[PDB]
Design a protein around this nucleic acid. Structure first.
Ligand code: SF4
Ligand SMILES: [Mg+2]
Ligand SMILES: [Mg+2]
Ligand SMILES: [Mg+2]
Ligand SMILES: [Mg+2]
Ligand SMILES: [Mg+2]
Ligand SMILES: [Mg+2]
Lengths: 447, 112
RNA sequence: ACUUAAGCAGUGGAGCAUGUUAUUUAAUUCGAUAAUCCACGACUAACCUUACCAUAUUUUGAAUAUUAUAAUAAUUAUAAUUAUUAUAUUACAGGCGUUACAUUGUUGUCUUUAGUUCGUGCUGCAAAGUUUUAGAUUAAGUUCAUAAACGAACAAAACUCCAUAUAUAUAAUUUUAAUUAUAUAUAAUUUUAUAUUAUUUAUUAAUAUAAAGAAAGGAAUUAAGACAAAUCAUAAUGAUCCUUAUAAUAUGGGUAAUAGACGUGCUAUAAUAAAAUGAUAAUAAAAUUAUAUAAAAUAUAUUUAAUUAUAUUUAAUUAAUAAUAUAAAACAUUUUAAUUUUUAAUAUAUUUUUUUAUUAUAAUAUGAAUUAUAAUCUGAAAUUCGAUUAUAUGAAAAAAGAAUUGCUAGUAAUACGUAAAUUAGUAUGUUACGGUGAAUAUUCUAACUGUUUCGCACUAAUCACUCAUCACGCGUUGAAA
C-alpha cells in the first residue's frame, strides 16, 4: 500500500539506463568501422586512451581521419550519455513544457553529439528553426556526423566555427572550457565569456566535462566566475545574477553560494595529502553497442595494461545555467527580490524553497541499512550535509529514501541532519634560517 | 523480559555475541530435549504401531519449538563468532585458526 | 629483462551447474564507479546459518558497578554483619550504523635487497670522497678476482629442513605392511682422468670420452620504499550516530525471481572411441571412523544369479588390528548408427567366429536437457527450495571462428579413479592422494630496473627557480613654459 510520493518522483533524476538509437548504432557499426580492420582502430584508440590516463588531463581534437573513426568508436558513447543525461535533467527541471528551444548550438570535439542527443530526447517530431553544430577537430568528422544524423528523422548545419552574427537559446558545450593542463584558471574564464555573449535571453547553457578532479575544478571555476559568490554574501536561494544580463544555476547545484568541494588547484588531488579529497561528479550507465563490444577486445583494450559487461559506467561533471528574459518586469523583479526578500539564513537541514530549484542534491551513493538511510547532500544552505532518514521517524519518507540514488534531488525532511565531513580535507589546503641558527646555537651550547 | 530466551541458560565462558548466545541456547535445549525428540520420533517411525499413535507423535514433534531442533545447531568460531570456514578440530574460523596456530596456542599444530 | 612473438598440447559456438551484473521484488542482505578491461567471497543458504523483507513481541537487555528489598548458608551476643542467589535501580549494555568515521597497525601486490650503517685507516683546506670498477663469469650474485683500504654487524650465502641412498636401534614378523614402521646418524653444493676447443695459459671454463658414485628434485629463513584494502571476516583505539530500537526474540518469506550480457566449471557433438562383460577376485596412495563407521546376510525393485538402489539387521573397529573400500583406467572378448562397409534366403569353399555368387536389405543403438508418474533418503519440516531410484519423455549439440589456458616433467592430458574438510541432508566447487603418462624449442618484442655519459641558475629539489607583464599606492631623481 506504500508507494513513492509524487514529490519524491519529481525529485528523482532520470534513472533508466542509456542506449543509443538503434538506427544510429546500426549505421555506425555498418559504415564507420566495417571498412576498418579492428587491430589498427584499436591501436589508435589505445593511443588516445593512454594520453588521457595522465592525472587531470584533457580531451583533444581529432587530428586525423583514422582518429575521427576511433573517436566515434570509443569516445562518442560516453559523450552522448553525458549530454543525454544533462538534457533530461534540464528538461525536467524547467518542466517539459518550457523546454521547446528553437535556436540550437552544439560545440564539441566529436560529431554533432549534443544535436543527436537532443534529437533522441525531443523525439522525431521536433523540427526547430536552426540546428547549428560546430565540429572542431577535423573537417572529415562532419561527413560522418551527417552519416549519424541521416538515420535520425538534414536541417542540422555542420560548421567548423561559431557563426558570429546570431544569439542562441540552447547552447551545449562538451569539453570546451579548457584545452591546456597549465593555463587552467583563466582559459575557463575566457571560454565561458565567449559563449555567454551569444546566449539569448531565456536561453540555456549546458556545460559538460570529463568527470575527474580536473573536470570538477573546471565546472567549479566556471560556476564561480559566472556567479561571483563572494559578491553576494548572505544571499541564499537562487535569484538570477548579474554577470541587463542575469543568469541562474539550474543543475546540479541547489544554491549559488561557494561550492563546498572546491579546492582551486587540481594538482592537490595528485599529492599524498589530497588523496582523501572529494569532487562533484555524476555517474550513468549506457549499454555498449555492438561496435563498442567488438572494439574493446584483445591485448590492446581488453587486458590489464599494468567478466565483461554489456554497459559502461561514465563519470561526468556538468553545469546548467539559464539566462533571464529582458523586460521592465523581470529587471525590477530581480532588484526587489534581492532587496526586500530576507529569505533567511538557510540553516543546516533546510530544504530551501521546497521546490525543484532548492531541493538538496544527492552527491554520494546513499548508505541503506535496515531502518535508516544516510545521504550525503549538497544542500541549499550552501553547505555539505549528512541526512539520516529512519523508519521510526516516518515510514513513507524512509520508503522513499530507500530507493534514492546519487544524482537525485532529495525533496523530503529527515530526522538527523548534521554537517558532512566530505569537506574535511579541504580547509587544510624562513624555516631554513631557523635551522641554520638553531644548528649554530646548539653547537656553541654543547661546549 | 529480562532474558531474551524462554529458559535461563548460563553464558559461555569466552567470547560473546548475540549469535553465539542464540547458538548456545539452542545447544543447551537440544541437550535437554534430545531423549524426548528421539522417543517421539521412534513412536512416529514404528510401523508396528497404530497410525493414530504415529500421527500423534508426529504432531507433537511439529509442535516443539525451534530451539530443540538438532538441525538448527551451527558450529561457530568460539573466538570470533563467525559461522563460515569453521574447523571442527579447533572450533575456530580459518583466520582465528591461523592466528592461534602461529601463536602456539593449538597443541601439535605446525607450519607445513 | 617481466611482458609480447614463435612452437607444442589443449580448451573454446549447445545444455546444465555456479558466480557477477542488469532488471524485478516486501526483500531479492553486503561488494565497483578520476575513460583500455574489471562490482565477482564461500570448506556446503530448506528452518538455522542471516547479515535482508513482512508481521507480532521484548525493553538495564550478555557485561561491570552502585543502592534497596526477599529469601538462603556462615559468624557475633537476640537482632546484627558476611557472603550466594533472585527482584528492582541507573550509569549503561547492545549495534552486519557511519571510511564522505580518522589514526596507527596489519595484510596483499609491486620495486630494491653483494647492500645499509658503524668503526678505524687514507685523500682533499673543506663540504665531501674512499677511488681498480663501467672487473671477469653464470641462466642467476651464480662463482671468483681485485683496489688506500681493512674490518664488524646485520642481509645474502653457507647452514637448516623435506625427499632420496645407506648404517645402527626397536618389533617375542598374529596390530605384518620386515617389500614395513620411526628414532638416531652418514652422504654430495659430487669427484677423478684424458682429448678438442677457447682462455686472463692452468692448478681455468665448456664440450666429448673414460672412472667412481644411489645421487636426480624441493621448501623455508631480512629488511627498506610505493600503492591498495573497512567481508580490515588481518585488529585496536578514537570520532560520530541509534537507544520503544539502527538493540533483542519468534513465525513465515527472501538470498533460488527472469528480459538480457559475461566469467568459471561439468556433460556432450562416435570408431587413434564409446558400451557391456571379466570371482581362487590384475595393479595404488593418502586420508577418515566416540557429535561414528558401517561388514556379511536377508527382502524389494527383479528377471536363475550377478550388477545397481533402497529397506531389515548392526558383525567387527574407536583403529599399523575392523570398516568406509575387490581402485579405476590399462588389458581381453563382444558390440556399436552414419555404412548396401550391414543383415537374411539359397548355393559355395582348403579363409568356416569366415570367403565368394545371386537375390532381397543430416541427431543414431550418439547426447541426456526438459517434463510426467510412482517410490526412496536426511530432517520436526523438502511448498517457495534439497538429494536418489524406476518407468516414460528424448530437446539443443554436427561445418568454420574470435577467444583464450598451460608449458621438462612425473608437469600437461586422462570416458583414470580414491580420500578429506564443510553437513542431519546435497558438490559438476575446494583441498589432498596415487595410476597411466606426452609433445615443443624461445628468430622476436619489451615496460621496468641497474649501471653509466653529458648538462644544470634547481636544493621543500621541475607541480623547481629566475625573468618579464598588469594594477594599487609611497618615495627619489631629471627636464621644464
Ligand atoms: S552540486 Fe554542490 S558540490 Fe556539486 S558543483 Fe554544485 S555546489 Fe559544488
Ligand atoms: Mg547445519
Ligand atoms: Mg533462511
Ligand atoms: Mg528466521
Ligand atoms: Mg559502545
Ligand atoms: Mg542489526
Ligand atoms: Mg543412450
Amino acid at each position: 500500500e506504500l508507494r513513492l510520493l509524487s514529490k519524491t518522483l519529481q525529485g528523482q533524476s532520470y534513472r533508466d539506463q542509456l542506449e543509443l538509437n538503434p538506427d544510429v548504432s546500426k549505421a555506425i557499426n555498418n559504415n564507420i568501422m566495417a571498412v576498418h580492420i579492428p587491430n589498427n582502430l584499436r591501436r589508435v584508440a589505445t593511443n588516445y586512451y593512454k594520453e588521457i590516463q595522465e592525472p587531470n588531463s584533457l580531451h583533444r581534437p581529432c587530428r586525423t581521419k583514422m582518429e575521427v573513426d576511433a573517436h566515434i568508436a570509443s569516445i562518442f558513447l560516453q559523450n552522448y550519455g553525458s549530454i543525454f543525461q544533462s538534457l533530461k535533467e534540464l528538461q525536467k527541471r524547467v518542466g517539459p513544457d518550457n523546454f521547446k528551444p528553437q535556436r540550437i548550438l552544439d560545440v564539441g570535439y566529436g560529431p554533432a553529439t549534443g544535436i543527436v542527443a537532443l534529437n533522441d530526447i525531443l523525439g522525431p517530431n521536433y523540427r526547430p528553426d536552426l540546428k547549428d553544430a560546430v565540429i572542431l577537430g577535423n573537417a572529415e568528422m562532419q561527413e560522418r556526423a551527417k552519416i549519424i544524423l541521416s538515420r535520425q528523422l538534414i536541417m542540422t548545419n555542420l560548421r567548423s566555427s561559431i557563426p558570429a552574427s546570431k544569439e542562441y537559446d540552447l547552447i551545449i558545450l562538451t569539453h570546451q572550457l579548457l584545452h591546456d593542463g597549465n593555463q587552467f584558471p583563466i582559459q575557463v574564464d575566457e571560454n565561458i565569456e565567449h559563449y555567454l555573449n551569444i546566449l539569448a535571453p531565456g536561453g540555456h547553457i549546458v556545460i559538460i566535462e570529463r568527470g575527474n578532479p580536473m573536470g570538477f575544478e573546471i565546472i567549479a571555476r566556471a560556476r564561480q566566475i559566472t556567479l561571483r559568490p563572494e559578491n553576494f554574501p548572505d544571499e541564499f536561494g537562487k535569484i538570477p545574477r548579474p554577470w541587463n544580463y542575469f543568469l541562474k544555476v539550474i543543475a546540479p547545484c541547489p544554491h549559488q553560494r561557494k561550492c563546498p568541494l572546491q579546492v582551486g588547484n587540481p594538482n592537490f588531488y595528485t599529492h599524498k595529502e589530497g588523496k582523501d579529497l572529494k569532487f562533484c561528479n555524476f555517474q550513468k550507465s549506457i549499454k555498449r553497442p555492438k561496435f563498442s563490444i567488438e572494439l574493446k577486445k584483445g591485448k590492446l583494450l581488453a587486458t590489464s595494461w599494468d567478466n565483461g559487461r554489456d554497459y559502461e559506467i561514465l563519470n561526468y561533471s556538468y553545469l546548467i545555467f539559464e539566462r533571464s528574459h529582458k523586460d521592465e518586469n523581470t529587471l525590477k523583479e530581480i532588484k526587489k527580490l534581492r532587496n526586500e526578500n530576507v529569505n533567511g539564513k538557510y540553516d543546516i537541514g533546510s530544504l530551501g524553497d521546497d521546490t525543484q530549484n532548492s531541493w538538496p542534491r544527492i552527491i554520494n551513493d546513499p548508505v541503506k541499512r535496515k531502518g535508516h538511510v544516510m545521504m550525503d547532500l549538497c544542500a541549499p544552505s550552501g553547505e555539505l550535509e549528512k541526512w539520516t532518514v529512519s523508519r521510526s521517524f516516518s515510514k513513507q519518507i524512509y520508503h522513499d529514501a530507500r530507493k534514492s540514488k546519487k544524482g537525485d534531488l532529495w525533496a523530503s525532511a529527515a530526522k538527523t541532519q548534521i554537517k558532512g565531513l566530505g569537506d574535511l580535507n579541504v580547509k587544510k589546503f624562513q624555516l631554513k634560517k631557523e635551522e641554520r641558527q638553531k644548528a649554530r646555537k646548539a653547537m656553541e651550547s654543547y661546549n | 523480559g529480562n532474558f531474551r530466551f524462554p529458559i535461563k541458560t548460563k553464558l559461555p565462558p569466552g567470547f560473546i555475541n548475540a549469535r553465539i548466545l542464540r547458538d548456545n541456547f539452542k545447544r543447551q535445549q537440544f541437550k535437554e530435549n534430545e531423549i524426548l525428540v528421539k522417543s517421539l520420533k521412534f513412536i512416529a517411525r514404528n510401523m508396528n504401531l497404530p497410525t493414530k499413535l504415529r500421527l500423534e507423535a508426529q504432531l507433537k514433534l511439529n509442535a516443539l519449538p525451534n530451539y530443540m531442533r538438532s538441525t538448527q545447531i551451527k558450529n561457530r568460531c568460539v573466538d570470533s563468532g563467525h559461522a563460515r570456514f569453521v574447523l571442527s578440530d579447533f572450533r575456530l574460523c580459518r583466520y582465528q585458526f591461523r592466528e592461534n596456530a602461529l601463536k602456539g596456542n593449538l597443541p601439535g599444530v605446525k607450519k607445513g
